[PDB]
Design a protein around this ligand. Structure first.
Ligand SMILES: CN(C)c1ncc(Cl)c(Nc2ccc3c(c2)CC(=O)N3)n1
Ligand SMILES: CN(C)c1ncc(Cl)c(Nc2ccc3c(c2)CC(=O)N3)n1
Ligand SMILES: [Cl-]
Ligand SMILES: [Cl-]
Lengths: 123, 4, 123, 4
């Protein structure tokens, strides 16, 4: 086509979606990880995760307001990944990298799994 | 704005 | 913070949100423009437009499944802007620039209004 | 991935 493009548009959209999350505006699901609860937008979860994409395209699960993750999933690992989904920023540290990689493999977030494997290989 |  | 960042994350999120729109997955509103109907995600509309942000933060309008725009709004101008919201790409042409600018002013999409003013000033 |  003959379209023009606004370079910062995608980043600005994601920044506004994170503002809506922080104010709990139009969130339509709660993700339960052990005792911890995380509110989010189903569309953002699907856009970032192969696991949520599969869950919310299912004709029965698409209507659930609560999703319980596998009890092996660490709430901190999930929190770091949910923050990444809404910001593009990953808080990867020596003390959390194993829990982050395991959570990203479960959530099917291929690019996060890739950087975790590389950071572990370096050490 | 750019030409993509 | 000490975060790392994935450069293409925001663009990849927006690409997946457009894939959901094209398949009509988790769309939660219909925007009526004269005789024409456009399905979309309220969160994406809010993230891109000052008008939709105001509408869907309203305690009564947040629950509406149908929004009717002002009859002066051109369906083609709206279609081009909805495509821009989900792609960052604007199909700006000599034959549509006046309808696109008028629709962007109504929708409160400041960056689109700015490029339309500049393109009109050049001609 | 980059240092933002
Ligand atoms: C694959 N596909 C057509 C598609 N359309 C829409 C959405 Cl929201 C979607 N999201 C999704 C699927 C798989 C994966 C991801 C997002 C991230 C990832 O590493 N794998 N994937
Ligand atoms: C202004 N604010 C705190 C905010 N938070 C969340 C959202 Cl979704 C939002 N969106 C929005 C508001 C105003 C405008 C836009 C988006 C685009 C624009 O040109 N003006 N604005
Ligand atoms: Cl990823
Ligand atoms: Cl804009």
């Amino acid at each position: 086509d003959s379209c023009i493009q606004f370079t910062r548009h995608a980043s600005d959209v994601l920044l506004n979606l994170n503002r809506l999350r922080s104010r709990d505006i139009l969130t339509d699901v709660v993700i339960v990880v052990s005792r911890e609860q995380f509110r989010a937008h189903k569309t953002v979860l699907m856009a970032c995760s192969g696991l949520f994409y599969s869950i919310f395209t299912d004709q029965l699960k698409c209507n659930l307001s609560v999703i319980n993750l596998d009890p092996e999933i660490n709430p901190e690992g999930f929190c770091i990944l949910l923050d990444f989904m809404y910001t593009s920023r990953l808080n990867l540290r020596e003390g959390n990298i194993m829990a982050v990689m395991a959570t990203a493999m479960y959530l099917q977030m291929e690019h996060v799994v890739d950087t975790c494997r590389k950071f572990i290989k370096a050490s | 704005w750019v030409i993509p």
